[PDB]
Ligand binder design. Sequence first.
Ligand SMILES: NCCC[C@H](N)C(=O)O
Ligand SMILES: NCCC[C@H](N)C(=O)O
Lengths: 193, 193, 205, 205
Amino acid sequence: TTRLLRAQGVTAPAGFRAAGVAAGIKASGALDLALVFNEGPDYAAAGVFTRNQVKAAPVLWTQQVLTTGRLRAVILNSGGANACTGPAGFADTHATAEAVAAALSDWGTETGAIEVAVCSTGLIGDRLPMDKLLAGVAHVVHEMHGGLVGGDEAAHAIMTTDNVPKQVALHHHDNWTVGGMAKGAGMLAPSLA
Amino acid sequence: TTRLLRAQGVTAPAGFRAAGVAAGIKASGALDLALVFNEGPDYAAAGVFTRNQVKAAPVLWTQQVLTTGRLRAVILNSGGANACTGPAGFADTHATAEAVAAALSDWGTETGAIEVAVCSTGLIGDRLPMDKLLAGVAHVVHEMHGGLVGGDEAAHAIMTTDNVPKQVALHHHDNWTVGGMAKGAGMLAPSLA
Amino acid sequence: TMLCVLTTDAAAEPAALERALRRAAAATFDRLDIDGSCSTNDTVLLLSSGASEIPPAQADLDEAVLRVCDDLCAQLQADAEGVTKRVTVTVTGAATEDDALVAARQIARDSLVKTALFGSDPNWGRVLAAVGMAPITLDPDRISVSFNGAAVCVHGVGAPGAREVDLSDADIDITVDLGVGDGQARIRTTDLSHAYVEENSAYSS
Amino acid sequence: TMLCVLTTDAAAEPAALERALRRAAAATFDRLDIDGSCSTNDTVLLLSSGASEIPPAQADLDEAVLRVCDDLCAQLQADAEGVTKRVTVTVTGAATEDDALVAARQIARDSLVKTALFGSDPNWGRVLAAVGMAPITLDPDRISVSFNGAAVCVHGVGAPGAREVDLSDADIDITVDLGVGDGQARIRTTDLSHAYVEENSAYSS
Ligand SMILES: NCCC[C@H](N)C(=O)O
Ligand SMILES: NCCC[C@H](N)C(=O)O
């Protein structure tokens, strides 16, 4: 009996931890930083991205990262797209991946930046508040777990103009699972490659 | 000095009559039917038309007419686009071109149907209320004059969701005039040929 | 922006994830069109821990990922900025599948179709106007249109009963048959309402 | 639908009137884009009575028709359904003339640009999102934007003071430079307001 179920997300399959924290990127103090972490033993990955010719620094970083087919973690922030922010914007994405890789190494799993995917979402053109973001990174590596509430928080944290989060998980009868979260409510017409 | 002037319409140059009547096509009882009338000596004409593959009968008709480079008149109604109305709809357009041609012959000029251009605007998918329209034709042909208030009634009669008419006339210094009326406030992105 | 993270404990190499994801993205996210504005940040990621140690057959991996993405799309559509109608646009009878997709996108993106739907107005004329601008093989005499299973336009003209269809319910299906082949496609969209305008004009986002 | 009748007492043959109408429409009517919905009824007609018995040189015929159309276009723009902003979108620095026009239409049709403009928000990011989707040669590094003369976007990034730009006036000029050639084009558009939505949903039109 294969089953597809809502109220379940990225920590439904085994081998994943997740969390969401309020970092102060959002003036509202709502959740805005999410981490998804691959426990192993495998780290296989694939990615598709906006075919928009104007690509945000996070999209540019994550495309290079995915040529390896290898990911240990995804770090995602709401409250700012980090789009149209130039080389300095790109340096901010790089430093986010780097802080994520350092925090996870300290925590007890050797990780390099090249194994960290980075996403952002929010307003175009604004610079990220790095001190707040980098404090959130430290925090979220410490809160991550495989419990369904971990997925919930990651899912809440990526929201911008969404009112409810989006999660689903397909439990296959052969005992493997696909889990997923999504966000987006406006500027919503994906064209992916 | 070449002066470009508003509130002046199709009746600004010489050899043209126009008027506009409340035939009763529009429920409001507002002005809804308009005639423009070429008085000669010349009868030259050009047209361009929507490139949309769904073309209303008035367009398909006027496109055929215009292959001759000649026009005596143009009849235009609002309160019905006469679009997506099939063979019968196309026949309503023809019967409009013929009732105009007849009304002009009874007025003093020998006019047949292939000399009258037809235009419609309004809702898509409805049939024109022909008994009102044909009675409109008699009345509007009777009321046409070379004076400025003629361009006006006409410019007023072609309106649908417009709040105000659109008129302009250029009086060139070599003693000739180009005048214009147009309509349209919504579903407005012309791709003409 | 649409962001999406997919995780799986199925054992599968990158190339296996890539096929699954690309197939899933084409059938779901590439056919979700709320407001026609494609972002600078759109990303979908698929990660595998292999923690089940079960390598599924590729068709079942593909299928599982598609079903997950597809349900996520439904959820995305259901919560769209200022949404009052969950609108599905189906084009059938096209020359090729791409033509059907192009035609359905044209319908779904049209401001007059969206506003008519916001007003619960089964305005088939607006649908015909819009589809006529799609760069595809089209015969205007052969087009039919249905709202919620009710044929309001057949053979390019009005059908008896047309301006009587009830679209007050939040779910609305527009089905358009082109009658010039066997291509078909389906877009998820939403209406253009006051709330959508309000949300995108009162503050910055 | 846009109907337009042009009369002249100048004397010209059908071939000559065609030239003036085709050049005018291509430069004015074809560049007037209020809500991206092209109708099933659009006609422009140019009639000559020749009652002045003066035959003008071609360029004088062209020019005069051109200027009449342009002014009609402006009046049409000013009285669009629920307009509160008379928006002109100019694109310069494109690789070809066509590229520019495609870029300008892309910006002018975008729901987010138009709703931002309605609320007087200089949300330049939405402009760059929009133009990045135009099937043209583009370099995201070399794009600049000014709203009403004031720069808001410099070489792909925010210009200092951008978010402070005043857009409360009815007229809004947008110039986008793509710095990839010298093709250029201008589109007349308007905003996406509550009044546009109410008018297109509250009743059948
Ligand atoms: N209201 C439009 C917002 C679009 C933005 N990319 C977001 O997802 O927040
Ligand atoms: N609300 C849009 C109506 C469009 C129609 N073709 C007209 O000109 O009235």
